């Protein structure tokens, strides 16, 4: 039997790249998949006939699995709600939400346009928040009604969100919001049987989506196995974790810690802080450097 046999999984941005790899990986392990992607079909509507979402659905069905396309824009709060309903209406419920949809608009902070900031924040951080909001309310409602909940949220952060990435300020901020939102979700939703975790694919993992296809450590398919496992019944005791992944590597990211402290026990004179700050900083753990520095 598959690792997620019978489970209903939504994957956002699943028309290509890593999201496509997750969709195929889940279906291969017995899940019924909602392939969510805004890419338009021949008629210019999201996820319709001729779309990337439908192409992935056809791959799944040709392999003997079950899937449906959905064109919700997760940055649109109401369409994110409708995405949860697509799963419930089509397949009878929802077990796993995989937040993957993203865009990049890479610029130095000093050269970032308003629209370039807004778009990256909206797709990544608002999109992840909106689906979490609506899926959690759904699962909480089942729990209130005495129903079975063993639900799973897997978010997509990045080393750029954890330690920063030069020339990717907007993207780094959004992925940082996603890492912390994962921590908070885990704390809030365990009450009604939902775990919340994140993966952070390496920057070298191949994440763009080319036309032609035919050990490659950087293949996006190498990221999905841990997502599928976290979406399984067996992963019920894992929550609030962030896993960095590439190829065959899995690394646990360890969160912000309390470093060196000093206490005056009174109000500091700003003039006296130089030696105080120098002392603290020499004693502090060296950080993981900003990516691209």
Q: Active-site positions?
A: 158, 171, 175
Go through 227-261 and write b for each residue having 16 or more CB atoms within 10 A of its CB, e for each that does not.
Answer: bbbbbbeebeebbbbbbbbbeeeeeebeeeeeeee
H/E stretch holding 68 reads: strand 66-70
Binding-site partner at residue 215 among a second copy, Cl ion, Na ion, none, CB < 5 to 8 Å by type: a second copy
Residues in region 262-281 near Na ion by CB under 5 A: 271
Shortest distance, position 33 Cβ to Na ion, whole Å? 17
Q: Hey, what are 27's tokens? A: 């279906």
Q: Hey, what are 167's tokens? A: 């020339």
Of 228, 265, 225, which is closest to residue 246 (Cα–Cα)?
225
Which CA distances in Å does 175 have to 80, 117, 275? Answer: 19, 13, 35
Q: Which of 17, 102, 161, 231 binds Cl ion (CB under 5 A)?
A: 102
Applying CB under 5 A, what is the total number of residues that bind Na ion?
Answer: 1
Binding-site partner at residue 258 among Cl ion, a second copy, Na ion, none, CB < 5 to 8 Å by type: a second copy
Residues in region 35-64 near Na ion by CB under 5 A: none
Stretch that binds Cl ion, among 16-24, 152-160, 175-183, 249-257 (CB under 5 A): 249-257
Shortest distance, position 21 Cβ to Cl ion, whole Å? 14
Closer CB to a second copy, residue 21 or residue 52? 21
Q: Hey, what are 120's tokens? A: 């990256």
The count of other CB atoms within 10 Å of the CB of residue 289 is 9
Q: Hey, what are 134's tokens? A: 């609506």
37 lines the binding site for Cl ion (CB under 5 A): no
Shortest distance, position 95 Cβ to Na ion, whole Å? 19
145 lines the binding site for Na ion (CB under 5 A): no
Using a 10 angstrom Cβ sphere, with 0-12 exposed, 13-18 middle and 19 or more buried, the burial of residue 84 is buried
1 lines the binding site for Na ion (CB under 5 A): no
Binding-site partner at residue 42 among a second copy, Cl ion, Na ion, none, CB < 5 to 8 Å by type: none
The count of other CB atoms within 10 Å of the CB of residue 212 is 4
Q: Which residues lie near Na ion (CB under 5 A)? A: 271
Q: Which residues bind Cl ion (CB under 5 A)?
A: 102, 107-108, 111, 202, 244, 246, 249, 251
């Amino acid at each position: 039997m598959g690792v997620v046999d019978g489970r209903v999984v939504i994957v956002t941005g699943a028309g290509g790249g890593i999201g496509r790899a997750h969709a195929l990986a889940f279906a291969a392990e017995g899940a019924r998949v909602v392939v969510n992607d805004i890419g338009v079909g021949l008629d210019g509507s999201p996820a319709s006939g001729g779309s990337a979402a439908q192409s992935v659905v056809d791959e799944i069905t040709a392999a003997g699995g079950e899937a449906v396309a959905d064109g919700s824009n997760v940055a649109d709060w109401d369409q994110a709600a409708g995405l949860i309903q697509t799963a419930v209406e089509t397949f009878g419920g929802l077990d796993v939400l995989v937040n993957n949809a993203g865009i990049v608009r890479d610029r130095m902070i000093a050269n970032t346009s308003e629209e370039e900031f807004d778009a990256v924040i909206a797709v990544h951080l608002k999109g992840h928040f909106a689906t979490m909001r609506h899926a959690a309310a759904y699962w909480r409602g089942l729990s209130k009604a005495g129903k079975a909940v063993d639900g799973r949220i897997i978010n997509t952060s990045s080393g750029a969100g954890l330690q920063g990435s030069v020339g990717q300020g907007n993207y780094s901020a959004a992925k940082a919001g996603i890492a912390t939102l994962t921590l908070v979700g885990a704390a809030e939703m365990g009450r009604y049987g939902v775990t919340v975790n994140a993966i952070a694919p390496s920057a070298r993992t191949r994440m763009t989506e080319t036309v032609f296809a035919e050990f490659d450590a950087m293949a996006p398919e190498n990221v999905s196995p841990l997502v599928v496992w976290l979406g399984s019944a067996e992963a019920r005791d894992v929550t609030g974790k962030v896993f960095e992944v590439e190829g065959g590597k899995i690394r646990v990211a360890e969160g912000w810690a309390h470093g060196p402290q000093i206490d005056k026990g009174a109000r500091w004179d700003p003039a006296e802080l130089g030696p105080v700050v120098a002392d603290l900083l020499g004693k502090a753990r060296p950080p993981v450097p900003v990516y691209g520095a």
